[PDB]
Every structure is written in structure tokens, then in C-alpha cells.
Protein argonaute-2
Amino acid sequence: AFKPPPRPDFGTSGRTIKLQANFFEMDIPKIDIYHYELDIKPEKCPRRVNREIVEHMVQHFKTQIFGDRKPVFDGRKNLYTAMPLPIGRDKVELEVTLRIFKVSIKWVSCVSLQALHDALSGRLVPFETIQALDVVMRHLPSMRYTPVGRSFFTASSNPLGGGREVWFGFHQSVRPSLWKMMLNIDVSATAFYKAQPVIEFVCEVLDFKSIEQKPLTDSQRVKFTKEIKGLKVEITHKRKYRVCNVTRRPASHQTFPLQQESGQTVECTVAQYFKDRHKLVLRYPHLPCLQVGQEHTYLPLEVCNIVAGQRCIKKLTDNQTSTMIRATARSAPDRQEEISKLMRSADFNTDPYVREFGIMVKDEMTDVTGRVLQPPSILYGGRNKAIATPVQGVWDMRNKQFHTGIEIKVWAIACFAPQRQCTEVHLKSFTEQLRKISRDAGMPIQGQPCFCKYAQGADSVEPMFRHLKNTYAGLQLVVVILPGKTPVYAEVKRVGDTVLGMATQCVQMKNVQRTTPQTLSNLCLKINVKLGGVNNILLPQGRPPVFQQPVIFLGADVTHPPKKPSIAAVVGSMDAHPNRYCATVRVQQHRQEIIQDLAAMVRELLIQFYKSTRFKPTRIIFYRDGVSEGQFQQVLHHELLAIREACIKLEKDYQPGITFIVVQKRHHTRLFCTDKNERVGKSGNIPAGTTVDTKITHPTEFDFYLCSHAGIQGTSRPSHYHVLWDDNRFSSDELQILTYQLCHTYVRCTRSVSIPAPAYYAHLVAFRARYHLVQALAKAVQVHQDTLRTMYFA
RNA sequence: AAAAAAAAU
């Protein structure tokens, strides 16, 4: 549990294809970079203020300290120069005025750019050197723009509603590769809060055309409170505050302790205070106040604006993200041009600071040779046992039937849509069309539903389900019908998955009224596996050597709340196909990325594997999603030990080979076809299966990019896979082929997906757990015994 | 919730 293995070899499988990546080569001098520390006092100022301080400090002290040198600054403590200041070592104390800060500057170290060069060729990486470069490259944009993490944004106009807005910008990061340093540049866009009076913000949040009223009900108040809680407001009557809460009382009645001349404190209303103190009679005294700072300062809504440049963290409404998707989605050729325009306007080679440090960035995207891997054949069952060949990451189930399809003889219908809109004719039409398709799918639904009724309310689910379970023996499935978003789906699943242990397939009302063969076919895919059926398997002989001996495939992922706990989910294969997965899920610490109870979860799965296959896996392949590079050493430490602990806990001399692989979908590397002949679809993306493990990947470690999916919309994100550990000593080809084939085992669609099925299943499990969430939390997530032997999360 | 992809005082 320590050091990632070196890259074993380079992949050679698949046909070559010319690509270009949004990585721009950096010509970097072999000099030393000089590193100074900065103690600014006070030391809690926002990074922007620190940058203003440093900026003025440099100019004000030109004659005696900085001269013609252009230093760069990281926003906090670290300042760099391309030439050593006349400091030598001894600390100096300074003053700066916007009002008055005390800055001390003290030489710490020499960042060797030569040490970086040799790390790039081999021997064998100074992180602080990479960081020094990053500080240099983003010094200028950090002042001209609004940095968010590693990106930069500005306002243009592009409303999303609810007080939210779209800001366009770009990601920027310096990355090591073999022989070279790379500048990663990609276009980006995120949600920002519109800068406007809080009054208007209230209208957009509560759907008012005009504010012109009467006190908010308890409902309107908590909606608005949730929206503005934690946001920054400024006063119209230049002061900034933090909104910590919205008062229950209106301004005319909300009071606070006010100390008079005698020293005695009395309660005074916010309305009365703003009248005496500011000659201001409140326009809307019936509206509540923003409680700011910390506990008794209150602000009326009409004297506050939402501070500009506030990024939106909270979950977007389904309509908000939609227009965001639409306004941000661009084809691969389109995105490539925007990056070119960005390089041209960023104009790095004329930036004063990178010129100062003698850095040169190339304005041509890096040429990369990729390899398009051959997809696995998909074996089906039924009469003819047809073999499907994915073309452009897609196949279908025409003239084909399930590997093992479940014959349905007993099933029920629970319509929670009103008979008014979902008529008896609809149900009968839906039922008839569903059965025809299912027949063809190799999952024959014989007999009309044993039961079919209507209902309303989440409170009606269990007694209705208690009913069905007790009276209909052999009951396999309850198809539930819902009208749009509604909290009964969560209730249907909670009762179905955790309490009674019954397979339930929810379906929208609209997909019942108007049925299509493709929709029904996709509905049958989920139904079959939820009854323990097997839709299809990888062509057995079209499999890598890893399947020679008992192996279990794990998919782990932790999802964080939109306070509320995080949810860790780990799934594991239960056969040799591999097809069926058992799920383990835990609630854990809010925003804790590491799976705390991993050892226990892995053990459970290992047992389940042994009871299903009567074999102990000789290898454990672990696909870990949702981990940033800055957390590798930490996650690799506890988690590799955790799964190794599970094996020891099982049996003393049980030591299966573990391959620890992190899967990353959240990065900003893009791959584009050099030949226009290689573009696929209207989106013009790279084909399903192109693999990159050269030039732009890690100089020493085992990592590769694999775009396993076909780009339908926008620009494809090629999934990144970084091997943190590998007892099994995989070759580059066999691993890359393995994860690619695993992307063809996702049962919800006849498509190759962007990440391997176990990783995708892990996501679904943790997210199903969210709906299960309506010490007792750990129980509202614990799932019935009979459902476990099914992929209920499918 | 048929489904993948896509922004993310």
C-alpha cells in the first residue's frame, strides 16, 4: 500500500488512428526558480485581496526590492521570482495600502527546473516544481478573471432561472508527460448566481413577475431560505456579508438588542432601527430579514444585492441543467475550434509573466497516435443463440433473444396515475405491446397481469404491497406507473428493496400512453435482470487470459449530498461471465471520500461470490471511481489495506492478487480525430474504443485513456484509468482490452458505456440508496435478503 | 422514473 507500479509496457492492440489532444507542449528553461514565503497579517483575507496586496507591494517597493522583476503569487503564502531578490535570506517587514497590512517575505527554497527535466526523461516527480509552473501560468488570469478551482470565468444574458446564470470560461493546468511538460486547456461553463437586488432574487426563486404583498407562508420561506443560505450579500445604502439564515419574523417585528447611550440594551425592531439610524422607512416591512455574520445582525431584503461572481454549488433543477446542457454542448470539431480561439486570445507567448520565467507554450494541439480496440462479441440465447457485434459502440436485439430470459407467469400493475389520464384502454394497449416485445426478447410474459388496480399517495404503497405479496403466490414483478416526479418512486423502492423484497419496475405515464418498440425493449432489459435473468454475456472465447481462474470484479464509488451523509457503494461480480453483481452500501461521514467500512463490504462480497460460484477468487480487480489525483496516496493507503484486510479476515493464507484501478471521467483532456474520415456521428467524436497510453499519459506510472463509448452529444470525455497497484502484473493490452470488454456488460442498454459496468453499478447503488433515505440511516439503506441475489439497482 | 451520451445590527 505505497507506490504505484511502473508502466509495464505499451499497448499494441487495435488499429492506429491519428488524434489531437488539448495538451500544448511547454518549452521550459533549465534554470532555478526562486521560492519565497509570504506572511500577510491579517492572514484570513480572501485570496483576491492577498493578490491585490502582493500586486501593490511589488510596485510600491520597486526601487528597493523588486526592481524590474515580475514575480508570481499563489494567492496564499507562496511567491516566486525568475531571479533572486536582493533578500538573500533574511526576512523583511513591509506595509501596503488599499487598509493596512503587514507583509513579511522570506526565501525558502530553489525550485530546480533541471530536476523536473530529469524526472520527465526518467530517474524517476518534484510536485513543488509542477506547482511552481502552475502558479506562473495562472498568475495573470487569476487577476483578470474569476478563478474557480482550476478554471477561470467571467460574465458576458444567459439566464437559467431561479437566480442562476451561465458563465463561460476555461480550465487550465500544467501536467507531466513523457519527455515533456504539457499545458491542458479546455473550454468550460458553470452556474453562477445573477448579481441583482435580493428582492428580484426572491421573485425569480418564488416565481413572481413582480414582488408587489403579504408575509411568506412557512413554505415560501424555507424555499427562499434554502436558496440564499450561505450566499454573499452586499448593501446598497458597499459592505459584504454572509447570509447564515432567513428570519421567521418580518422586519417590522424582528427585534435585536440595541445598546443606548446609558449603556442599557433594549429590543428594537429592524424596521425602527433603519428608520432612526438611516432615515429609511422600509418599503416591504412584511418580508423577513437576512441574518448575516454570526449571532444578532439582521438585514432587510430591500437593502441587499447578491454579490457578483458567486459560483452555484447547490443542485440544479431538472430544467436548469437542461438549458445548461443545451447552451454548453458543442460538437467535437466545434470544441476544438473554441480551444484554438482560446489559445489565440490567451496568447501565452506574450504574457509578461511566462516571458519573465522564459516559458514557451505551443499553439498547436499535441499529435497523438491512438488505437481503436476491437469490441467483444455479445452472446445471446433463446432459439438461435445469436451473436451481436457492436458497431460504433452500439448493437441491438433485433433477431435476438436473452441468454437466459425469465418466463413471467405472475405479475401485477400498480397505476399511481389517475384513471382520468391513464385510461384502462392505455393499460391494455400497453400490456399487449409489452408482451409482444417481451416475447421477442426471449423473456416471455405469459398471462395477463394477475392483478391491476389504481392508487394515489405514498402512504398507500406498503399495505398494497403487503397485500400482493401475501395473496399472489409466485408473484415475480410489480410494474408501477407514475405521473412525473413524485416521492412515491422513493417509497416504492424503499418498500420493494428493503422491506418486502419484491422486484418492482417503475414506468412513466407517458411511456404507457404512447409506447414504442425500442422503449419497451429497453424496459425488458431491466425487468429480466431484476428477476435474476441473464440478458447476454461476453463471447466467452473472446475474453482475456484473466478469466482462466476465479476472479471477482469490484466497482466502488461514493456519492456526496447535494449536514447530510455521504454514501459508499461497492458491487462485485457473482459469476464468470461476468454478468450478475451483488451490492454493498453504507452511509458514512459527510463528504468523506474514503470508503470507511470497505474491509467489511469487500468481505461480504467475497462470501457472496463463494456461495454463488463455490470458488474463491484468485484475483480481485478493483475499479474505484470518484477520486482526484490529489487524493490517490490517501485512498490507495487505507483502501488497498482494507481489501487486503478482508482477505486476511476471511482466511489466513488467502492472498488473491489485487489490481487497484481508479477511473476518472472528470478531467479536461479531449481527443479529436485528425482525419475527418474518422469522425463519427453528427457530434464528430472519436470512435468507440480508441485508447491512448502514450505521449500525454504519465511518464512512469501505469495509466491510459479509453473512450469506450460512442459520443452521441457534445464532445466525448475519454475515461481515464490509473493503476495504483497490480499484483497480477497485467500487460497494457490485456488490461485495456479487459476494461473495454467490461464496458459491454452493462445490462441497461445494448451499448458500450463510458465506464466499466461494476463502476457504473456502484453509482446506481449509492444513488438508489439516496431514494432509500426517504445508525437508523445505516438501516434505511440496508436491503432485504431476497433482493440481494438480484441486481435490484438496475 | 425505458436508456445511453452530454454541462457540470
About this structure: The longest helix of chain A spans residues 632-650. The two ends of chain A are 33 Å apart (CA to CA). Chain A has 21 helices and 38 strands.
